Amino acid sequence: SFRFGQCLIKPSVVFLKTELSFALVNRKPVVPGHVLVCPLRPVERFHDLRPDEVADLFQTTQRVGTVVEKHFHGTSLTFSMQDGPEAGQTVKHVNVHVLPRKAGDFHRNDSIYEELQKHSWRSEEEMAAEAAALRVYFQ
């Protein structure tokens, strides 16, 4: 029922839906709690978004980061958007990466962008369990 690029996202992996955005759990997370926030409209490039979509996309991203930071016991967050083919985008749909960070997770803080640019899978039940847990934070 949800669109992510050329693929249909199962609802079970989505834990937030706004008027214009939505957040989903990752099939291959770089760290625990690595989630994605996207516009509901499938546009490839960040510059394709209207102003209200930009506001919604990142107000949502703000709320999602604070939730995943607490749930996965992080003390900081990495936000990253790979806006276009030459920045690592695989799925042709604007998406914001939200990663909880803990002291010592990467000995080098700058090696989490190597891992993001290289975007074996988690199970449907494992992903739906994680999303269902995160849903509790938004009521």
Ligand X SMILES: O=C(CCl)NCCCCCCNc1ncnc2c1ncn2[C@@H]1O[C@H](COP(=O)(O)O)[C@@H](O)[C@H]1O
Which residue's CB is nearer to ligand X, number 16 or number 36? 36
Under DSSP, the state recorded for 87 is G
Interrupted backbone of the chain, residues before each interruption (C–N > 2.5 Å): 119
Which residue's CB is nearer to ligand X, number 110 or number 139? 110
CB of 77 to its own copies, least distance (A): 4
Binding mask 105-124 toward ligand X (x if CB under 6 A, else -) reads --------------x-----
Binding mask 71-90 toward its own copies (x if CB under 8 A, else -) reads ---xxxxxxxxxxxxxxxx-
Which residue's CB is nearer to its own copies, number 1 or number 104? 104
Per the CB < 8 A criterion, the answer to whether 6 and 38 are in contact is no
Per the CB < 8 A criterion, the answer to whether 74 and 102 are in contact is yes
Q: From the list ligand X, Na ion, its own copies, none, pick the one residue 9 interacts with, judged by a Cβ distance below 5 to 8 Å according to partner type.
A: ligand X
26 binds ligand X (CB under 6 A): yes
CB of 8 to its own copies, least distance (A): 26
Angle at Cα 134 formed by Cα 46 and Cα 93, nearest 5°?
Answer: 20
Closest CA to 64 of 125, 1, 127, 135: 135
Per the CB < 8 A criterion, the answer to whether 98 and 25 are in contact is no
CB of 92 to Na ion, least distance (A): 7
CA-CA-CA-CA torsion sign (98, 103, 105, 107): positive
Q: Which residues are near its own copies by CB under 8 A?
A: 46-47, 49, 51, 54-55, 57-59, 62, 65-66, 74-89, 99, 101-103, 105, 109-110, 113
